[PDB]
Amino acid sequence: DFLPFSRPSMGDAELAALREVLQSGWITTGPKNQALEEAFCQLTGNRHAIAVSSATGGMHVTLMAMGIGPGDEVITPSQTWVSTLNMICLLGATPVMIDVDHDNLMITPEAVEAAITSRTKAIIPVHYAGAPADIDAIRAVGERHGIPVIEDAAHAAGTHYKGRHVGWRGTAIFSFHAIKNMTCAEGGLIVTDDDELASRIRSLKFHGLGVDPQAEVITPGFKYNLADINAALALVQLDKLAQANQRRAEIAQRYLRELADTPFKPLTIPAWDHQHAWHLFIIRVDEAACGISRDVLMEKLKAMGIGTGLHFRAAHTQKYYRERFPEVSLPNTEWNSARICSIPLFPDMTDDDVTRVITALHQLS
Amino acid sequence: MSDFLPFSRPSMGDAELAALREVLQSGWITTGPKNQALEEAFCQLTGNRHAIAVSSATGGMHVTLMAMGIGPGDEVITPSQTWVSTLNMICLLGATPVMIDVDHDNLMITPEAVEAAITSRTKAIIPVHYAGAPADIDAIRAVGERHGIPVIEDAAHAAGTHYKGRHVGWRGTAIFSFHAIKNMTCAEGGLIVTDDDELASRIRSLKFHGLGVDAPQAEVITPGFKYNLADINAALALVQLDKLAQANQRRAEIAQRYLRELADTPFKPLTIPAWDHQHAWHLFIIRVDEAACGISRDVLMEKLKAMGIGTGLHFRAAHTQKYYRERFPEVSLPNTEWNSARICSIPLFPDMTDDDVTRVITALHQLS
Ligand SMILES: *Cc1c(COP(=O)(O)O)cnc(C)c1O
Ligand SMILES: *Cc1c(COP(=O)(O)O)cnc(C)c1O
Ligand SMILES: [Mg+2]
Ligand SMILES: [Mg+2]
Ligand code: NA
Ligand code: NA
Numbered sequence: 221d222f223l224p225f226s227r228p229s230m231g232d233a234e235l236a237a238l239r240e241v242l243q244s245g246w247i248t249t250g251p252k253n254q255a256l257e258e259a260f261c262q263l264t265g266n267r268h269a270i271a272v273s274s275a276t277g278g279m280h281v282t283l284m285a286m287g288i289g290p291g292d293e294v295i296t297p298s299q300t301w302v303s304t305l306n307m308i309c310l311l312g313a314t315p316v317m318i319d320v321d322h323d324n325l326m327i328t329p330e331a332v333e334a335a336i337t338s339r340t341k342a343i344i345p346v347h348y349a350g351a352p353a354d355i356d357a358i359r360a361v362g363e364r365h366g367i368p369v370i371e372d373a374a375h376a377a378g379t380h381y382k383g384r385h386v387g388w389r390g391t392a393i394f395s396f397h398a399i400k401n402m403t404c405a406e407g408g409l410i411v412t413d414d415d416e417l418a419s420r421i422r423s424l425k426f427h428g429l430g431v432d433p434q435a436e437v438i439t440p441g442f443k444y445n446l447a448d449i450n451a452a453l454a455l456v457q458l459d460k461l462a463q464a465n466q467r468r469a470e471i472a473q474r475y476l477r478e479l480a481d482t483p484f485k486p487l488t489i490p491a492w493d494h495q496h497a498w499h500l501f502i503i504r505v506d507e508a509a510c511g512i513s514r515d516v517l518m519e520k521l522k523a524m525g526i527g528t529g530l531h532f533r534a535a536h537t538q539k540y541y542r543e544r545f546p547e548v549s550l551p552n553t554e555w556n557s558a559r560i561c562s563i564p565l566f567p568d569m570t571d572d573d574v575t576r577v578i579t580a581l582h583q584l585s
Numbered sequence: 586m587s588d589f590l591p592f593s594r595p596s597m598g599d600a601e602l603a604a605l606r607e608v609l610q611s612g613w614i615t616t617g618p619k620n621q622a623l624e625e626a627f628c629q630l631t632g633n634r635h636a637i638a639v640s641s642a643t644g645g646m647h648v649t650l651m652a653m654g655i656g657p658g659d660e661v662i663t664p665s666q667t668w669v670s671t672l673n674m675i676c677l678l679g680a681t682p683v684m685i686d687v688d689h690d691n692l693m694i695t696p697e698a699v700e701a702a703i704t705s706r707t708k709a710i711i712p713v714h715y716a717g718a719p720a721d722i723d724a725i726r727a728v729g730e731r732h733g734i735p736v737i738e739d740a741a742h743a744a745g746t747h748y749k750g751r752h753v754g755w756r757g758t759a760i761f762s763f764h765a766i767k768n769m770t771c772a773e774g775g776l777i778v779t780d781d782d783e784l785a786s787r788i789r790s791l792k793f794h795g796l797g798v799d800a801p802q803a804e805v806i807t808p809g810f811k812y813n814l815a816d817i818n819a820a821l822a823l824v825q826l827d828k829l830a831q832a833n834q835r836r837a838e839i840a841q842r843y844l845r846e847l848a849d850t851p852f853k854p855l856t857i858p859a860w861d862h863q864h865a866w867h868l869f870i871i872r873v874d875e876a877a878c879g880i881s882r883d884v885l886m887e888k889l890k891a892m893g894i895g896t897g898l899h900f901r902a903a904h905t906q907k908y909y910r911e912r913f914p915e916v917s918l919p920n921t922e923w924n925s926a927r928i929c930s931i932p933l934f935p936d937m938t939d940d941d942v943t944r945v946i947t948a949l950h951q952l953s
Binding site for chain 2: 227228230231234235238239242243245247248273274276277280302303305306307309310397398403405406427428429432434436437438439440441442443445447448449450453533535538539540541
């Protein structure tokens with residue numbers, strides 16, 4: 221009877237796809253990877269798609285292929301998952317953590333521009349919770365200074381910005397982790413319009429192998445390829461994505477309406493034209509307004525059989541980054557990081573599941 | 586295409602599909618109870634203390650060397666006669682691979698070659714258990730102990746390999762692979778066993794973002810990577826581990842027939858080690874010397890393919906590949922170079938029929 225904050229929608233279609241792969245005998249990277257990549261080119265309109273074993277690995281090889289390393293700075297929010305900051309550091313580069321908008325939790329072009337230095341080699345905006353960042357404005361800052369923008373689109377499968385899917389141009393990295401809007405348990409995919417970057421990425425995610433003749437190691441690379449077992453699941457889930465996101469939107473709209481007369485504060489919907497994917501439904505819990513703290517709300521909801529998530533504890537408040545970058549002070553991030561939680565949002569939720577959550581929040585206010 | 590006999594094919598059937606159904610129905614599809622069961626199963630299989638499932642043996646090597654503190658200024662002794670993943674991971678941690686030769690007939694490093702290559706900078710030794718036979722790991726370990734240098738075993742080929750009556754990795758540290766051509770597979774995956782408590786603790790953190798508990802809630806203690814194994818894959822690996830004994834018994838039957846029926850051909854299998862062992866028979870490798878066989882290795886592979894018979898090359902020595910050839914042009918490894926130019930792997934997988942085996946043997950006799 222526990223209602224988790226997320227659960228995948230796996231059924232007979234996924235099992236039938238798995239049966240096909242197993243029957244074929246070709247279970248690692250093969251035709252299903254190619255079909256998934258072609259499908260994401262059709263979805264986004266971008267040129268190149270590279271399937272990978274996780275969005276974290278995708279970020280690792282994308283930054284590596286761009287040549288980012290010691291002496292380089294990478295602008296990123298602290299208000300994101302730690303994978304991006306970790307990959308910057310593990311390439312020897314320096315994350316430059318910037319604040320986010322206090323109500324949609326995404327970086328602004330002004331904050332990006334203020335943080336640019338002669339060392340900046342990449343800017344990594346996050347499309348947060350299913351809404352897009354103001355990517356044209358961020359891209360314009362990058363273009364003015366000759367700095368590439370790499371989009372963290374983990375939350376943005378099915379997100380549109382000014383009438384196009386996220387990643388229609390430039391470079392973006394999607395996630396297929398279990399709680400994402402389409403999942404193959406673990407997986408990811410990079411889209412890019414940059415031919416050379418795409419060529420480097422494909423080699424660096426598969427041992428650095430390339431043709432100088434037979435394939436051989438051109439420069440050392442990692443192992444981040446996606447098996448066809450997983451790619452086949454992702455194809456089924458992509459086929460379901462439009463309907464899944466429609467259901468998520470219906471649930472989120474009901475949360476927006478029925479929590480309007482509670483002190484719990486959702487994120488604000490951006491003013492630029494978009495279609496929200498509704499990956500997460502985040503609320504801010506301020507004890508002064510709500511009569512209950514964020515941590516206690518999570519605990520009491522759990523005691524009522526209702527799961528919640530924390531997306532995310534800001535990276536700069538975590539031990540490694542807190543001690544390496546003690547000077548970082550990001551007020552909007554710090555205020556929200558202490559007050560946000562994610563309430564249940566997934567397309568297998570019934571109307572009664574949603575009513576249960578809303579009733580509990582009303583009771584706990 | 587339907588009549589092509591590849592050099593390997595997985596054995597995936599209703600049992601694997603039923604395991605996948607269970608995980609999907611549960612809704613818990615990434616790392617969870619199937620990972621824990623797989624790890625416990627490998628602790629029971631090997632007798633070792635700690636088992637850490639990972640997304641690939643390459644990733645496992647990456648985080649194991651990282652957890653050991655391997656980095657700039659450190660040397661790591663390894664064969665060139667192995668898969669390039671190990672050399673790459675050494676280099677991508679900033680460390681220096683020190684490539685040594687292998688025995689000319691079993692393609693595994695010797696304690697003497699390891700000892701000769703040790704310097705004050707050596708921080709690890711990585712023997713490879715090749716094709717399903719174990720390296721002489723007690724002798725290699727003794728060299729490491731004498732100099733205080735850890736030995737990390739590449740056991741990708743050695744699921745089901747025994748050495749002096751124990752499974753590979755019963756002590757020390759070893760890394761298994763569950764890639765599609767390995768004797769048990771979940772398409773992509775691997776697993777580290779270790780008897781070192783601190784190393785295991787570091788590895789578990791470093792394969793999942795560096796998360797740990799401060800001296801409280803989990804937080805990044807130091808940056809780590811993402812190399813966890815999904816439960817969908819762990820569930821497949823559990824079925825395949827349950828099948829492993831019978832799969833390896835069939836592989837041994839096939840390999841024994843190759844050993845017998847190629848004995849009167851000029852093709853030269855690897856030699857069986859003199860130390861007590863049980864061979865897993867991951868690969869059946871033959872040496873193709875044009876003087877003895879009347880045909881070259883490359884041409885044999887091409888002609889076998891024209892006959893609908895697949896082969897593999899395990900492996901083109903790392904030091905002969907562009908990056909390593911140009912970075913380490915001074916490396917000269919005679920046994921490795923001789924074999925690398927002459928080896929290929931003929932079909933060996935447990936779903937092969939007796940008639941499939943006869944087809945391979947007949948073609949090799951015809952092409953001699
Ligand atoms: C979890 C997540 C990632 C990493 O994705 P994986 O596929 O799990 O590696 C990156 N960015 C954001 C915003 C995420 O939520
Ligand atoms: C393939 C292989 C590896 C790497 O295993 P993955 O699971 O593919 O990362 C390591 N060592 C040897 C000897 C191999 O054949
Ligand atoms: Mg409200
Ligand atoms: Mg012979
Ligand atoms: Na939507
Ligand atoms: Na055997």
